[PDB]
């Protein structure tokens, strides 16, 4: 029975699955897919190692709930990078059968309407908003499927509560129409202890497996000795050519024509511990594919930030580093190079662990102490689950390097297990949930309000709702007639997907901005769409004051109209208040975005502001999301003179462009530099680019360099000719299917 052809499956999807290598399932997937009425709608909650092909069952169930019972489906993923990878994977897997798959990730939204879509690959943040939109207009009959990758995220997380709110709201809808399902829910999780609780909460069937196609050997390293998980010595390591012996371990891994993952606790540590192995691989291997590696170097060299000095020293030896400091393009290039075997040693941080699927033969975790704290058991499991490539390696090795006292934390990580899932639900999450149900009209009376809380994970794990209702009533989010009805502010909060806690100050700030606005720059329209400071960078006070001393004769007008000062503007803090700190740290943040929408090169922004390019890109993505939310908030409040101003800044921040390119960047392959060089040559509209001379745009893309040197997000590397051919084809499709 274990064969993808025996199971009912489209021929096109079957032949696409044979391309990636999936031709015979495992026993665990069959036992999970044949777990009673799961194929009919009984929700499904299952656990498996990430290397065991967890998502195959989810994709099969989607194809089912989409083909047989034609309806929409949601694929909720934890992060934007993995969500985009899954969106492109599902697109390449489902294009032939005609299932329109599009993504709601970060700032990007599908050009086509959600009604035209058939699968929405969403982040946790945007899937909740999508379901809120479906409930408001009441199009909840379109939804028939919801898939939640990384179900364990529903516990303690900054975006996990939105996951719980996503399901307890759906279940109520299914359990209020009952006065094998109407909306199926399929969840993928890790080896959680209380998975059962989660399975019973969602009524889902529970499937737990521990099968790993490639066996895993986790071990600790103390001094020169290697011990297994159960405090048993397994090997006496002796360095081959050593000048921790981290480099010797990497050398031993490399000698057998394999690759290695090296998880370091910081960025500078990754850059240092990739330089070191590069130096030894030169000296130890030169007594002093290439072509593919030179292609990778050239791909990295035609980027807005260009080549990196440490990357330049490391990469032409098989060794490199992959941390959050690099741009998303550089990170994807390095990840692709490692995935193809071109890069053999990858010094990465913990951020990779939870990101893309990047398996390595040996995973060396330098220290059990990550960022001054012991490594998380979930983080450790995520790292060591990458040890072993399926279908290539016979085994996989994880080596955690510990010493002295550190040995204790290492053995604790070796013998530890995942903590149980939580609920995280007065509190902001419960306020959000109460507002979501009341404003959607799904629940009106307080008896219904407690009935809703009887459907949440808190009720399954085993007052607050009254406090939440009181808070929403006292803050004019909700009116009482005691039937609770949404107000205009309460409806606008649920529409623009913002926390009701933040929406109060957002309302005050926008209302103050309407009274006095500065239209002679884009800084006032940016201070409103600037999310916060958070921790996106470590602000240098002197640098800030210097920039401020050199602002146009019109910026400081915007600075003083929003709350910034000069007596406290990188002044007092220069030689050394919770709101003024949040204003200046928002002013600086709004200055950086000012250079992002002014098309300033990332390296120049880094030099003038001191923030690296990864932080700048993260900030611009967050600001674009916030701009979209603020635009919807003003749209639903009847603020036509502010929504009109904000309607373009989401795109101008997503792509970091000027207004002129806002039509060119609609093309998927025109980010902010293949559109500026294509705009200077006379193409200023997606109309002029549909018939743009093919060979002409090839020449233009060949010029202006900061074979497949051009790198495209989701398309990896593209040759100039193929790149601009796809550019003109995308322009043709955009202008042809939008009218
Ligand atoms: C405020 O909405 C944003 C808009 C731009 C960019 C980011 C956000 C955002 C930010 C932070 N958290 C969440 C969101 C979010 O996506 N909320 C959404 N609500 N509705 C959407 O459209 C989906 C949709 C539309 C029509 C139908 Cl019939 C069905 C579904 S998206």
From Swiss-Prot:
<feature type="short sequence motif" description="DEAH box">
    <location>
        <begin position="149"/>
        <end position="152"/>
    </location>
</feature>
<feature type="region of interest" description="Interaction with RAD51">
    <location>
        <begin position="707"/>
        <end position="739"/>
    </location>
</feature>
<feature type="binding site">
    <location>
        <position position="29"/>
    </location>
    <ligand>
        <name>ATP</name>
    </ligand>
</feature>
<comment type="similarity">
    <text>Belongs to the DNA polymerase type-A family.</text>
</comment>
<comment type="subunit">
    <text>Homomultimer; forms homodimers and homotetramers. Interacts with RAD51. Interacts with ORC2 and ORC4. Interacts with RHNO1; interaction takes place during mitosis and promotes POLQ recruitment to DNA damage sites. Interacts (when phosphorylated) with TOPBP1 (via BRCT domains 7 and 8); promoting POLQ recruitment to DNA damage sites.</text>
</comment>
<comment type="function">
    <text>Low-fidelity DNA polymerase with a helicase activity that promotes microhomology-mediated end-joining (MMEJ), an alternative non-homologous end-joining (NHEJ) machinery required to repair double-strand breaks in DNA during mitosis. MMEJ is an error-prone repair pathway that produces deletions of sequences from the strand being repaired and promotes genomic rearrangements, such as telomere fusions, some of them leading to cellular transformation. MMEJ is required during mitosis to repair persistent double-strand breaks that originate in S-phase.</text>
</comment>
<feature type="domain" description="Helicase ATP-binding">
    <location>
        <begin position="35"/>
        <end position="210"/>
    </location>
</feature>
<feature type="binding site">
    <location>
        <begin position="48"/>
        <end position="55"/>
    </location>
    <ligand>
        <name>ATP</name>
    </ligand>
</feature>
<feature type="region of interest" description="Helicase activity">
    <location>
        <begin position="35"/>
        <end position="453"/>
    </location>
</feature>
<protein>
    <recommendedName>
        <fullName>DNA polymerase theta</fullName>
    </recommendedName>
</protein>
<feature type="domain" description="Helicase C-terminal">
    <location>
        <begin position="244"/>
        <end position="453"/>
    </location>
</feature>
């Amino acid at each position: 029975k274990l064969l993808l052809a025996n199971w009912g499956l489209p021929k096109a999807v079957l032949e696409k699955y044979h391309s990636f290598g999936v031709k015979k399932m495992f026993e665990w997937q069959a036992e999970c897919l044949l777990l009673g009425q799961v194929l009919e709608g009984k929700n499904l909650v299952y656990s498996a190692p990430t290397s065991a092909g967890k998502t195959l069952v989810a994709e099969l169930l989607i194809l089912k709930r989409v083909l047989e019972m034609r309806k929409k489906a949601l694929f909720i993923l934890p992060f934007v990078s993995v969500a985009k990878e899954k969106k492109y994977y599902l697109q390449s897997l489902f294009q032939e059968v005609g299932i329109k798959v599009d993504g709601y990730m970060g700032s990007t939204s599908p050009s086509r309407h959600f009604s035209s879509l058939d699968i929405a690959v969403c982040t946790i943040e945007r899937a909740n908003g999508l379901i809120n939109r479906l409930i408001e207009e009441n199009k909840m009959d379109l939804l028939g499927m919801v898939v939640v990758d990384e179900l364990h995220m529903l516990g303690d997380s900054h975006r996990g509560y939105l996951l719980e709110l996503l399901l307890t709201k759906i279940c109520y809808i299914t359990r209020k129409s009952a006065s094998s399902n109407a909306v199926q829910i399929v969840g993928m999780s890790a080896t959680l202890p209380n998975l059962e609780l989660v399975a019973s909460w969602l009524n889902a069937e529970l499937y737990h497996t521990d099968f790993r196609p490639v066996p895993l050997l986790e071990s600790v390293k103390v001094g020169n000795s290697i011990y297994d998980s159960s405090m048993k010595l397994v090997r006496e390591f002796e360095p081959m050519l050593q000048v921790d012996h981290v480099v010797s371990l990497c050398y031993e891994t490399i000698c057998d024509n394999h690759s290695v993952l090296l998880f370091c606790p910081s960025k500078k540590w990754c850059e240092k511990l990739a330089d070191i192995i590069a130096r030894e691989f030169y000296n130890l291997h030169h007594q002093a594919e290439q072509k593919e590696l030179l292609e990778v170097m050239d791909q990295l060299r035609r980027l807005p930030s260009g080549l990196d000095s440490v990357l330049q020293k490391t990469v032409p030896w098989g060794v490199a580093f992959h941390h959050a400091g690099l741009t998303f393009e550089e990170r994807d290039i390095i990840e692709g190079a490692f995935r193809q075997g071109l890069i053999r040693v990858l010094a990465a941080t913990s951020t990779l662990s939870s990101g893309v699927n990047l398996p390595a033969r040996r995973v060396i975790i330098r220290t059990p102490i990550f960022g001054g704290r012991p490594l998380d058991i979930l983080t450790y499991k995520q790292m060591v689950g990458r040890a072993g490539r399926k279908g290539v390696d016979t085994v996989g090795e994880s080596i955690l390097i510990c010493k002295n006292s550190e040995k204790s934390k290492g053995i604790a990580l070796l013998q530890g297990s995942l903590k149980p899932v939580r609920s995280c639900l007065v509190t902001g999450s419960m306020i959000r949930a109460i507002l979501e149900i009341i404003v959607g009209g799904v629940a009106s009376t307080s008896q219904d309000m407690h009935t809703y809380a009887a459907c949440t994970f808190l009720a399954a794990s085993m007052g607050a709702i009254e406090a939440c209702v009181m808070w929403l009533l006292e803050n004019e989010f909700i009116q009482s007639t005691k039937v609770y009805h949404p107000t205009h502010l309460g409806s606008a909060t649920l529409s623009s997907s913002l926390s009701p806690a933040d929406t109060l100050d957002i309302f005050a700030d926008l209302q103050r901005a309407m009274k006095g606005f500065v239209l002679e720059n884009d800084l006032h329209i940016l201070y409103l769409v600037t999310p916060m400071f958070e921790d996106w960078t470590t602000i240098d006070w002197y640098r800030f004051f210097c920039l401020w001393e050199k602002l146009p004769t019109s910026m400081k007008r915007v600075a003083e109209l929003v709350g910034v000062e000069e007596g406290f503007l990188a002044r007092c803090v220069k030689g050394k208040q919770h709101r003024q700190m949040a204003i200046h740290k928002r002013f600086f943040t709004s200055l950086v975005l000012l250079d992002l929408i002014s098309e300033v090169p990332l390296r120049e922004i880094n030099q003038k502001y001191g923030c690296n390019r990864g932080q700048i890109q993260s900030l611009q993505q967050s600001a674009a999301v916030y701009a979209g939310m603020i635009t919807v908030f003003s749209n639903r409040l009847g603020w036509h003179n502010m929504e009109l101003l904000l309607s373009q800044f989401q795109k101008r921040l997503t792509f970091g462009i000027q207004r002129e390119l806002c039509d060119l960047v609609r093309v998927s392959l025109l980010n902010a530099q293949r559109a500026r060089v294509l705009y200077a040559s006379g193409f200023h509209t997606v109309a002029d680019l549909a018939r743009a001379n093919i060979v002409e745009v090839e020449v233009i893309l060949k010029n202006a360099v900061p074979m497949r040197t051009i790198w495209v997000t989701g398309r990896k590397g593209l040759t100039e000719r193929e790149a601009a051919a796809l550019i003109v084809e995308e322009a043709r499709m955009i202008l042809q299917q939008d009218l």
